[PDB]
Structure 1
Amino acid sequence: DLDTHFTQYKLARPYIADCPNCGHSRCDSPIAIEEVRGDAHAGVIRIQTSAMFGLKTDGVDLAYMSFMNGKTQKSIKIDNLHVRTSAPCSLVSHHGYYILAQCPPGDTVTVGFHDGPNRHTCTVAHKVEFRPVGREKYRHPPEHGVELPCNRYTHKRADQGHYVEMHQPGLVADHSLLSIHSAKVKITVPSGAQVKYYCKCPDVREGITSSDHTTTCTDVKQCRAYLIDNKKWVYNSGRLPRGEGDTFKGKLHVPFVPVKAKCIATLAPEPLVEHKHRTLILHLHPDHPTLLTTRSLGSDANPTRQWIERPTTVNFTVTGEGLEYTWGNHPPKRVWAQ
């Protein structure tokens, strides 16, 4: 039933852009990333890469990725699609421009596939942190505990909660179209695609053509080697210049919509309760920083919130009205006084 998303699959094409830190510098990688949404709880991150992986050229090979190299696209294997942070991540799912993965906390996020003879990596600076849902500020999803209503990105892809617009792309330059005709510059076409064309010298001023030659200018460096190729539209990225004509249709659903799932949260060890005369002593040992809250049941609340990390001993004046305390994400408990 994965063939009901052809609007993303067919109407969209692979895309390339300014990666800020492509390898050792700022090259123009085919997998330039943008709008990483690290706002869930379970450590999952949604990344919108410029490359649009999904089905193959026509309709098949979900397990293949299709990026754009030079003038043309190239659908190849997805063998070494790598997503990294301060520590290496682990892929979960991918669809269209968006790839869903979970990462450990870190200061930067990197994405890189493998063509096989090439590395082709890209990264960006972006704070990534993940506080688990609950009162126990842990740092890795535990094996057991109690469940709470966290916020997490949907594991599925066939959803239409939100949409992203895909208009016609804007013309890209490519001076390799400007071949040499022994003494003049000679532009040639990819498939009959539109080539907006003109040089600093006065010559052909629009360019909507097959392979033209240049009468006036000679050096390729002063000529508009542009390709208007909106046979397959792209997302209105901030790294691609705008098509002056119009913003075409192609409203595309967001693949991984955040949903309110139920993550499994940690549970702190139960405190050792020791009773005295009209005072409650809580002998406890926290495994990870947990805040405990106390609240008197009388007219005056006298609340107290205190995160504790090292093992500590605390006291509480339990009045005749009574006292209640919440240690970690355990259910609240109340107490008497004689």
Structure 2
Amino acid sequence: DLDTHFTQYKLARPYIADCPNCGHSRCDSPIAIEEVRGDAHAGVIRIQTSAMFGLKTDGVDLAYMSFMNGKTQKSIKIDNLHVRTSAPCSLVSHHGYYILAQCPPGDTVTVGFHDGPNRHTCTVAHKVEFRPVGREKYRHPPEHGVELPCNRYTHKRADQGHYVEMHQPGLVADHSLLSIHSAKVKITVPSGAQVKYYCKCPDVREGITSSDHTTTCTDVKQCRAYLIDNKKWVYNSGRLPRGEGDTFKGKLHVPFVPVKAKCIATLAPEPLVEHKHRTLILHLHPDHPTLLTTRSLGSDANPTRQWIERPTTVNFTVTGEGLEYTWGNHPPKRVWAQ
């Protein structure tokens, strides 16, 4: 069942990109963050990291993760993966490049695993707000209340609703290929991968080879140290160069498609009703800001709505045509008068 999505599993491989605030400065972390999607209602977040979470090398180890350490990857466990904001979050599911979590409200989002001798985390400035379903401006999902048709990301991954292009990655520089042949700069190969190669000085101008040596130039900071390694494909990230050869296809399904689920919503305390001649008096004791709306049923609607936070007592002139009011998300009520 879980091995029925090999379009992403085998054909894609995580790469390294330029995290805005890696650790303490702008480094090139393997967990670079892309496309923070904070659009769900219940504060659920989707994050697209450049590291590939999910299966092991071939098809196994859901509890493992795969990042790229220099020119080669090394799949390890998911031991201490943590996604964090203003307050630490709680991860829900990880799949491919995407992570689903439920974060508290906050202004910054961070993603970071723990290799064991190092942290290797990344963070990006991107605010994430809470938008409570309905008319009751709460801050966290309550344990009870009436449910409403919210919109939220689904924890399921075996979906084909949307796709994202996965072309051959651009080539990557690796100056550690540029060893010294005692007096000349010398290039090895990872596994026979294509090493684009050339220096400022006139020498070998293409590089489609095994381990070459330089005839002309001397300095390792005056040669192109590249690796075309599109035996494994990468996401169409805006942080990697694009190989001018051609743009590969191979679009894979997006893990967490938004769905129209049903979230529990808070229910404000019921009003204390009191009355005088042609006059409703309404006592309100809200715990959180909740919108009150009112509507006269006569020819003139004469609407009135206001967010109320502090406990307050309000009034309403009730004509014989009658009056409706909708405190919180309680069913609307209506009345006559003497």
Does TM-score exceed 0.5, indicating one fold?
yes
Normalising by structure 2, report the TM-score: 0.99
SS at match of 2:176: helix
1:58 positional shift: 1.4
SS at match of 1:138: coil
1:121 positional shift: 0.5
Unaligned runs of 5+ in 2: none
1:249 positional shift: 1.6
Following the alignment from structure 2 to structure 1, what is the Cα–Cα distance between the partners of residues 63 and 119?
Answer: 19
1:255 positional shift: 0.3
Summarize deviations over 1:69-101 as a string: whole Å, max 9, x none: 011001001111010000000000000000100
1:336 positional shift: 0.6
Summarize deviations over 1:205-261 as a string: whole Å, max 9, x none: 000000000000000000000000000101110000001111112111100000010
Following the alignment from structure 1 to structure 2, what is the Cα–Cα distance between the partners of residues 46 and 300?
Answer: 46
1:318 positional shift: 0.2
Summarize deviations over 1:176-215 as a string: whole Å, max 9, x none: 0001000001000000000000000000000000000000
Unaligned runs of 5+ in 1: none
Following the alignment from structure 1 to structure 2, what is the Cα–Cα distance between the partners of residues 18 and 204?
Answer: 30
SS at match of 1:36: strand
Correspondence 1:122 to 2:126 = no
Following the alignment from structure 1 to structure 2, what is the Cα–Cα distance between the partners of residues 133 and 270?
Answer: 19
SS at match of 2:34: strand
Summarize deviations over 1:140-179 as a string: whole Å, max 9, x none: 0000000000010011000011101100000100000001
1:128 positional shift: 0.6
Aligned counterparts, 1:242-321, within 5 A: 242-321=242-321
Summarize deviations over 1:19-72 as a string: whole Å, max 9, x none: 000011000000000101000011100000000111101111011000000110
SS at match of 2:307: strand
1:110 positional shift: 0.2
Give the alignment's Cα RMSD to 1 decimal: 0.5
Following the alignment from structure 2 to structure 1, what is the Cα–Cα distance between the partners of residues 277 and 127?
Answer: 50
1:279 positional shift: 0.4
SS at match of 2:127: strand
Identity %: 100
Following the alignment from structure 1 to structure 2, what is the Cα–Cα distance between the partners of residues 36 and 140?
Answer: 21
Summarize deviations over 1:259-281 as a string: whole Å, max 9, x none: 01000000000000001110000
1:135 positional shift: 0.7
Normalising by structure 1, report the TM-score: 0.99
Following the alignment from structure 2 to structure 1, what is the Cα–Cα distance between the partners of residues 242 and 217?
Answer: 27
Q: How many residue pairs get matched? A: 338
Question: Could you tell me which residue of structure 1 aligns to residue 325 of structure 2?
Answer: 325
SS at match of 2:288: coil
1:104 positional shift: 0.3
